Paper text:
Rspo (R-spondin, also roof plate-specific spondin) proteins are evolutionarily conserved from fish to humans and have well-documented roles in a broad range of developmental and physiological processes resulting from enhancement of canonical and non-canonical Wnt signalling. ZNRF3/RNF43 specifically targets these Wnt receptors for ubiquitination and turnover, hence reducing Wnt signalling responses. Direct extracellular interaction with Rspo proteins inhibits ZNRF3/RNF43 activity.
The ZNRF3ecto crystal structures revealed a distinctive variant of the protease-associated domain topology. Two β-sheets (comprising β2, β1, β7, β3 and β4, β5, β6 strands, respectively) splay apart, accommodating an α-helix (αC) at the open edge; two additional α-helices (αA and αB) pack against the β4, β5 and β6 face of this distorted β-sandwich. A disulphide bridge, conserved across species, links two structurally elaborate loops, β3–β4 and β4–αA. All but two of these crystal structures reveal an extensive interface (average interface area 992±109 Å2) formed between two ZNRF3ecto polypeptide chains. This dimer is conserved, and pairwise structural superpositions yielded r.m.s.d. values of <1.3 Å (for 275 equivalent Cα pairs). The interaction is twofold symmetric; strands β3 and β7 of the ‘subunits’ abut face-to-face at the core of the dimer. The β1–β2 hairpin forms a second interface by reaching out to embrace helix αA and the β3–β4 loop in the opposing subunit.
Numbering used by the authors:
A (entry chain A), B (entry chain D): 54 to 98, 113 to 204
Write the structure that this text describes.
């Protein structure tokens, strides 16, 4: 169940000597996707190997949306996403909705985050360009 | 100014437990760009945080090409590339033209390889399409 998420900044010194910085957050796996660990370069919402980070907004703003959260999940997997992380803060409904795709469940894991862990995540993304996530269990 | 390049493949297991495979490699940093070290996902020849990896073909095939090497180099950095690795194994003279950019050098490192290090890379990039690069010095 619990999905451990490491976010990893990387940064070089003029020397060549580099330094890497890492941040632990925790969210859950959606039964909508696999129970695998995974990793790639983060992307907020190609070539393969990337991690969608998707902030869900209130559905009041999006009464009937383009794609449902699942659709967005699956859409991501088919653009190469090695995994997908929704921030479900603004809409706790997505959890309930995410977890209705156990029948035809994606082959890449599908994690949501909320509250204090969601806010850590978002702060790192927005402040820095490069960034790779690991997602474990 | 020797570049130590490591290509790194991730491969989860059903358990959550996972495995990393790292293949070291050597190259050269061109004066056309920086003497930093960098990290990012690999792309052979939109995102921020990638390492382009360009094979250069025998320069008869392409007599007057769209872009030069250094024009390629700069296209990738313009499009986010955190570095660029050219494969010059089939076009040795690229080295010469890369290093005439050494009073305009690019923010991101520009690196090349050739011969056996070249193959290793190319071998790994194709056989699996989900690969990560750290580049040193």
């Amino acid at each position: 169940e619990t999905a451990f998420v490491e976010v990893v900044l990387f940064e070089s010194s003029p020397s060549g000597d580099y330094t890497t910085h890492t941040t632990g957050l925790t969210g859950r796996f959606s039964r909508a996707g696999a129970m695998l660990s995974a990793e790639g370069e983060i992307v907020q919402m190609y070539e393969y190997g990337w991690v969608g980070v998707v902030k869900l907004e209130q559905p009041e703003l999006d009464p009937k949306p383009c794609l449902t959260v699942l659709g967005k999940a699956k859409r991501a997997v088919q653009r190469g996403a090695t995994a997908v992380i929704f921030d479900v803060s603004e809409n706790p409904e997505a959890i309930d909705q995410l977890n209705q795709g156990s029948e035809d469940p994606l082959k890449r894991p599908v994690v949501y985050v909320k509250g204090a862990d969601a806010i850590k995540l978002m702060n790192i993304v927005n402040k820095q360009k490069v960034a790779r996530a690991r997602i474990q269990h």
